[PDB]
Write a protein that binds this ligand. Structure first.
Ligand SMILES: O=C(N[C@H](Cc1c[nH]c2ccccc12)C(=O)Nc1ccncc1)c1ccc(N2CCN(c3ccc(C(F)(F)F)cc3)CC2)cc1F
Ligand code: HEM
Ligand SMILES: [Cl-]
Length: 444
């Protein structure tokens, strides 16, 4: 029968913009607690948003098919970045084929030379930028630079990187990104407001696609196995080749998806590990990595870093970079004793569910040894058919960075406490001006 309870609204135009914008973690716990329901509804500018904040009900968000809970309508703001006809904007079966092709480029089959590529690039960075015996750095910025540099070294052949270096790629992604209005997911009318300067999303994507076109022409001329080369062998079930427009789009998706999420996960991980109270965990990290050779390989990172993986997964559990995942409800869904109606946005919140007292007791505590106490409660990388395809690659990057950085340097946070999360950006990370750290090169 029953609609989920709606948190009381006192200003109709805005709904709960003020309280949700200011502090999503507090506000979502408040609704859940005061409405006495894991499943509840808020308003963003009048759009109903129904949140499935009971982890026992996660599968009611993650299992229904696309024609019932449809991501397309929520992510139409990405069309200028990924492209028309690409990903979400393609018919559902074709979307799935395209994403599957990109997932195959990021599985363990492709990783055998990634660890040394990552390591070589990290060391280049540290040698260029962490030069003296000690120095002060912004860690969130530097981790960001290492994430883009490493991913490019892994995924793009040398011919590509001669036309399109990591800094130039970074600039292209920044222009695509800065054009986006995250709230237009809930309030599409925001696209009608004037901008402070012209957007450059369409020009930046056109330039990327033109570079890739030119690289392809050249490769074809000289007579194969980077990301670009793999996507060029993609053939759909209808017997047609993935187009240049689509290949470009999957490449943007891949770089775009990782750039803030992996950076932030790296940064948080290092921020907890270096905090004085977490000395026991840093010691345990050293036990695990202190017997490694200078030149790490696939086995060391994939098989011999379980504790460091737990550090990374717990940093995501505590402070998930993506606070919510969303679907447009095309046909009503039953969730527990409620029915979520057609036209709602339905969402599952890693932020909310990771603070559930049953699933994660003392959830503001960073405890790499914890396990979820409700199965499937951790949803940092989603679940079901839309689960993260970049998750293995991302974890390979982060763990390689950690093993390399903490081998050569000690770190000290220049404030008393790990940063507050800054909930003001669409991908959520530690507050930037709080991420000053002092490195000290270890006696070798
Ligand atoms: O970051 C995002 N999208 C990119 C791009 C991307 C999207 N689909 C993908 C699928 C695969 C790969 C990349 C992507 C991405 O990189 N996503 C990604 C996806 C999977 N893996 C890695 C990365 C993204 C993040 C958040 C987001 N909102 C969050 C909260 N909102 C909101 C609005 C108003 C209020 C207030 F009014 F104040 F109340 C409060 C909150 C608005 C929406 C929207 C986002 F689009
Ligand atoms: C720590 C880093 C990352 C985090 C925390 C993260 C998180 C997530 C989450 C929560 C989802 C579920 C989205 C939904 O259900 O709507 C997801 C899906 C996805 N992620 Fe990531 N991700 C990360 C890194 C990456 C990387 C490096 C890629 C590179 C390709 C990527 C690509 C994707 C894609 C394509 C999906 C789509 C699944 C779909 O709709 O089929 N992610 N990710
Ligand atoms: Cl386009």
């Amino acid at each position: 029968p029953t609609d989920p309870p709606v948190y009381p609204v006192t200003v109709p135009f805005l709904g709960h913009i003020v309280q949700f914008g200011k502090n999503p973690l507090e506000f979502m716990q408040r609704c859940k607690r005061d409405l006495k329901s894991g499943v509840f509804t808020i308003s963003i500018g009048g759009q109903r948003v129904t949140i499935v904040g009971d982890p026992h009900e996660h599968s009611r968000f993650f299992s229904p098919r696309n024609e019932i809970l449809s991501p397309r309508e929520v992510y139409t703001i990405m069309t200028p970045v990924f492209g028309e006809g690409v990903a979400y904007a393609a018919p559902y079966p074709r979307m799935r084929e395209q994403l599957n092709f990109l997932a195959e480029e990021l599985t363990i089959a492709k990783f055998q030379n990634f660890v040394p590529a990552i390591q070589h690039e990290v060391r280049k960075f540290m040698a260029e930028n962490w030069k003296e015996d000690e120095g002060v750095i912004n860690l969130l910025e530097d981790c960001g630079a290492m994430i883009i540099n490493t991913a490019c070294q892994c995924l793009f052949g040398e011919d590509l990187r001669k036309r399109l270096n990591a800094r130039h790629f970074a600039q292209l992604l920044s222009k695509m990104e800065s054009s986006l209005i995250p709230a237009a997911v809930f309030m599409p009318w925001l696209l009608r407001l004037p901008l402070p300067q012209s957007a450059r999303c369409r020009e930046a994507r056109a330039e990327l696609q033109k570079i890739l076109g030119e690289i392809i022409v050249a490769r074809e001329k000289e007579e194969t196995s980077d990301l670009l080369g793999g996507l060029l062998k993609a053939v759909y079930r209808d017997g047609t080749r993935m187009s240049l427009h689509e290949v470009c789009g999957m490449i943007v998706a891949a770089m775009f998806a990782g750039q803030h999420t992996s950076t932030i996960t790296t940064s948080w991980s290092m921020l907890h590990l270096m905090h004085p109270k977490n000395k026991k965990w840093l010691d345990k990290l050293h036990k695990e990595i202190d017997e490694f050779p200078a030149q790490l390989n696939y086995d060391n990172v994939m098989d011999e870093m379980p504790f460091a993986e737990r550090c990374v997964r717990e940093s995501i559990r505590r402070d998930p970079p993506l606070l919510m995942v969303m679907r447009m409800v095309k046909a009503e869904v039953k969730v527990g004793s409620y029915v979520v109606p057609k036209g709602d946005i339905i969402a599952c919140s890693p932020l909310l569910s990771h603070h559930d007292e049953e699933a994660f007791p003392n959830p503001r505590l960073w405890d790499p040894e914890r396990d979820e106490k409700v199965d499937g409660a951790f949803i940092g990388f989603g679940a079901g058919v839309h689960k993260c395809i970049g998750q293995k690659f991302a974890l390979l990057q982060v763990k390689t960075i950690l093993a390399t950085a903490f081998r050569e340097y000690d770190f000290q946070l220049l404030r008393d406490e790990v940063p507050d999360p800054d909930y003001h950006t669409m991908v959520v990370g530690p507050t930037l001006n709080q991420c000053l750290v002092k490195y000290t090169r270890k006696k070798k």
